[model samples]
Target chain A: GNEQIQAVIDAGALPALVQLLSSPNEQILQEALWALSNIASGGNEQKQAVKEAGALEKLEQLQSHENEKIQKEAQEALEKLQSH
Target chain B: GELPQMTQQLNSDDMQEQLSATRKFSQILSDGNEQIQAVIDAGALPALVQLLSSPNEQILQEALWALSNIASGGNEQIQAVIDAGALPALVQLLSSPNEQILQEALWALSNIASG
Candidate 1:
């Protein structure tokens, strides 16, 4: 799990995972949200990198998602993000 | 604020404002290549990289998200983040006691490693 995510970072796929935040599929949204949440958990630069890629707004938008999972996931990530 | 305004906010003195502003940019760039290109053209890379050293966790979290999204992009975008010397800084998060921080860092590094 650690190595896979490490590969993800090296492969530079964060933007694709980020784009999925708007996917109509709730499954994709949840999965993407989890992936992004992990990226946010990583470090300061990673956080800025993700923000520059435009994740902050997508997360906030999903906070009101009809799907509880999506809403929760987004909120969880957003709290970590918005606290600053 | 509009996309233009958000970029300015990315450099705010207040940690929250910078966090919120950069957060807006992340979403805008995610919306389309047009937005992404616009931000890239606006020179968000340097400022984004500068925040990696921010003392605030929330700011750092948002910065990581922004960088992850940027790195997720193709050659031009990926190179942008890499050129900013973000790899070393991102890799440093794995040891963070904060799972959230570690997870986010691992994710970005994973995507970068995938390349």
Candidate 2:
């Protein structure tokens, strides 16, 4: 998981994943948030990279998504991204 | 601000402002080749090309989008992107792990090649 996280970060997939936060598909949104949270857990640099991709505002918006799973994932992802 | 003014905004001291401008270019470029030419004529190519090197992923993504749209124009417009030093930078992004970035890079390169 650690190596995979670094690979995703190095792949510059942060912005693309960040863009997916707006996906109307609950599954995709959930998956993107899951990926971002994992990426955030990598380290401060990785967390900052996610933040830099403009994930925070969208994640905050997703906190109220009608899908319960999405809401839960978005909230947790937001917390993970903002972690120090 | 008009197109030229907006192009100037791409170089703003504030990163957010630069992003704001870049997003506008992305939107404008999507209108079609006419708008792309107008943006190129407004001197957007240099600033947009320079932004390909930005450490900010969103900024880089938007710049690539703009350049790709510009490449969809005539040979002059496509070559304009090449002349702006976008080719080398975009070549580097071809290996980007991000599917969207890699796709955008390919679109720009493909357009340039076919031009």
Candidate 3:
């Protein structure tokens, strides 16, 4: 499972996922948050991949989404990306 | 397979189980706020703090790594760690004979104070 996560990133799925964050469809946006959060759960390289794809700023914006679920998800994901 | 499972692993009677889970937990904490919240929410703080007193240095070090990362999450998370009674245990390690352990303890404390 870990290997597959790494494989997904190596295939350059990050930018596409980041793009989905701005999708008009709520389901698409939620899925993007889930994927990005999983990727961020990995080691530093994987986390950096998500951040470098410009997900950080998008996540920050999503923090105030009209949907509480999406807003909470975005905040949680953003917390992980933050540098210690 | 996920956090709850991993969190349970921390309570294992097997030291190896605890150590491996702690190591993975450290890596997970390295990157996310939600996961960090999830980790603490899943009730990892007590076991992690308890590991600070483990006879095994490896376990102690791994637990410190995870706690340090958690501490970096912000004041609330750092306070959660402290609420779990990590402060005294961490303070005690500051004088460990092993330089690595001492350093790791210091790192965790610094994160706490940095809050």
Candidate 4:
């Protein structure tokens, strides 16, 4: 459902996502980051919501991720927020 | 007080004021505030060229920066800046050893050459 992903982000899912950053499950982490990207890319309200949920630090940590694609996506998302 | 009125003139329906505003804005951009830099980087040259005849210090720098960004893609937009007399300022920027400035200058030159 639409709300399921939204709920994941709203119900303090960022910490879990950060934890899963180290998971061997690439698919799981990719899906989680994709969702996080969407959440982070939302307007200012959702942006602050993600920050309050501590997504920023995790996202920054992901910048050094060995997976180039993940690192790039995370970096792009971070720049988008920072540039605003 | 008068400045606000002048600013308002920039947005005026009059063609002359619109042209004047474009020139002044182009001049201000040469001072290189990141905000204006971002806009020029994002391909705002056509709008900027309206002030070409008035190319002052501020306008020149902004034009150089815009040329650099546009050159990265080797697009026709660089030619328009060249036609407007941006080459000399661009060459000076290129000769400087400042890596960042040099990169932008080279990029602009390459773009203009390719265009």
Candidate 5:
């Protein structure tokens, strides 16, 4: 947790994670959502980065996904937007 | 227990609660290794950044000192502090009247910029 998420983001993981939201596999989608949530929880700028980088739109779209698990992770990921 | 308990103290609205916690947490983070990781897991960055504006210079000094250590930990650690919006405060603190405050801020900024 010593900023591993930030390094991932700094390593250009944001767009990749965001793109993975549209992946076909629900497992990939859930993992990407979970990762984004953790990154958002990192700090204000990171939250803003995710929020501003099309995360909200992706999150909103995924929240209504047919799979409860994917929807749940998306819901949890949305908390960062509120907290920020 | 120390981690969760002190984290609460650090986040308290009361300066007294935050003061002691700041000192303790600052000292704990200064120890390096898994210690700093625990602080990161505690979601301590936001509260730690909040302490930068503390009117209490002691808190400010310790916050800066702790932030310096946190910044020097790694690129991710530095980015975490940077993402907390700490750079502006640290830069402002560079002009602080207290030399020690300036000292800590300078070290913090150096790491933040370099790390």
Candidate 6:
């Protein structure tokens, strides 16, 4: 799984999560989102992984979720990852 | 439906699954339900906020818990919640809370104040 962790890290779970954001499979999407956030929250190294993977914009897109909780956390995580 | 499945995963004997579940639980707090709120309340808020304000790296998680619930309402509610003691606690939480928590709380507070 950690092997996939690198790929997942590089792939930027944000984009992948976005694609899966509205999926009926909540488990899959939840797992994907958490995977992305975990990597994003890991600080600089993984932030680069997400940047290279090109998930920043989509992650930004989630910043306006009707659910403030989602928007706040997603935006904050994105801002932190990108600021560094 | 998914919550139950997540509960099962969270309760699994596997360490990885458990860790994954905890992380997922954190994400779920973003659009969490009553049960999630219950779990959050299980933690001591004042103490949690205090720890969050401390130089702890994991303050992000605690702040997330607070922001998620608070954001569901407005400034009056926010003030009420904070005035009831969530503000000083929140301020303390923000003092040294991680980047994520600080950002989330600020956003949540602003949203509450604006509305």
Residue lDDT tens for model 5, B1-115: 4565444345545321110100001122345833575656666866676799877888887777777677666566767667777755755654555655644554555354334
* Per-residue accuracy of model 3 over A1-84 as CA lDDT, tens digit each: 233334445544454565556866665576566656655655434567765788888888889889887898887776555544
Candidate 1 vs 2: which has more DockQ: 1
Q: What is the DockQ of candidate 1?
A: 0.06
The deviation in Å at residue A32 for candidate 3 is: 41
Candidate 4 local lDDT, residue B19: 9
TM-score of chain A of each: 0.77, 0.83, 0.85, 0.64, 0.84, 0.52
Prediction 3 global C-alpha lDDT: 0.62
The best candidate by lDDT is: 3
**Which residue segments of model 2 deviate by more than 4 Å?**
B1-115
Candidate 4 residue B31 Cα shift, in angstroms, is: 51
Tens digit per residue, CA lDDT, model 2, A20-69: 55767555566566556655655435567655878888778778877888
TM-score of chain A of 3: 0.85
**Interface root-mean-square deviation, candidate 4:** 21.2
- Native interface contact recovery, all models: 0.08, 0.00, 0.00, 0.00, 0.00, 0.00
TM-score of every model versus the real structure: 0.41, 0.40, 0.41, 0.34, 0.41, 0.31
Scored by CA lDDT, what does every candidate get?
0.58, 0.60, 0.62, 0.45, 0.59, 0.43
Give the DockQ-based CAPRI class for model 1.
Answer: incorrect
Point out the higher-scoring one by DockQ: 3 or 6: 6
Clashes of each: 65, 0, 4, 2, 0, 2
Model 2: which residue pairs collide?
A: none
lDDT of 4 by residue, B24-108 (tens): 0011222433334345554366544433234354564565555555533333444445545455544443334344443344334
State the lDDT of candidate 1 residue by residue for B5-69, as single tens digits: 44444554545422331121122235453347455655686557568767777877888887777
Ranking 1 against 3 by DockQ, winner = 1
What's the TM for model 1?
A: 0.41
